[PDB]
Swiss-Prot record:
Protein species of origin: Homo sapiens (Human)
Superkingdom of the source species: Eukaryota
Function: Regulatory subunit of the ATP-dependent BRF-1 and BRF-5 ISWI chromatin remodeling complexes, which form ordered nucleosome arrays on chromatin and facilitate access to DNA during DNA-templated processes such as DNA replication, transcription, and repair. Both complexes regulate the spacing of nucleosomes along the chromatin and have the ability to slide mononucleosomes to the center of a DNA template. The BRF-1 ISWI chromatin remodeling complex has a lower ATP hydrolysis rate than the BRF-5 ISWI chromatin remodeling complex.
Subunit and partners: Component of the BRF-1 ISWI chromatin remodeling complex, at least composed of SMARCA1 and BAZ2B, which regulates the spacing of histone octamers on the DNA template to facilitate access to DNA. Within the BRF-1 ISWI chromatin remodeling complex interacts with SMARCA1; the interaction is direct. Component of the BRF-5 ISWI chromatin remodeling complex, at least composed of SMARCA5/SNF2H and BAZ2B, which regulates the spacing of histone octamers on the DNA template to facilitate access to DNA.
Protein family according to the UniProt entry: Belongs to the WAL family.
Tissue: Expressed at varying levels in several tissues, whereas a smaller transcript was expressed specifically in testis.
Domain Bromo, first and last residues per copy: 9-113
Compartments in which it is found: Nucleus
Official protein name in the record: Bromodomain adjacent to zinc finger domain protein 2B
Amino acid sequence: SMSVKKPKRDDSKDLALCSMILTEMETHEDAWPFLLPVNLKLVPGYKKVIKKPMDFSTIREKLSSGQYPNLETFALDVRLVFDNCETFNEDDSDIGRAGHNMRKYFEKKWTDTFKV
Ligand SMILES: Cn1cc(C(=O)NCC2(N)CCCCC2)ccc1=O
């Protein structure tokens, strides 16, 4: 509360660590469905069904331009990528399984990097 300061973690490396994690995602073999925005004019249903689209390139732009206030908002956009993928794709489709694989891949790096 007012004048009662909770000790806080050192966040000074967060930008560079989130960037490294995103680089790992971008280079993963199963990243291809998520590297660019879904083409809203060529993919039936996407625009109406998926209320907040997100992809790695948009995340990279937001990270490179100071649009994430904290690491929690960065992980929200990452998780949004895979939530959208689950909403729109069958678990066993190529894109659907890629999303599941990428989510697991992300969450381990997140715990390994920040749950010190
Ligand atoms: C996350 N996601 C992606 C698509 C999609 O179209 N991805 C790219 C592709 N169509 C065009 C360039 C490479 C070949 C495949 C559809 C539904 C979805 O949920």
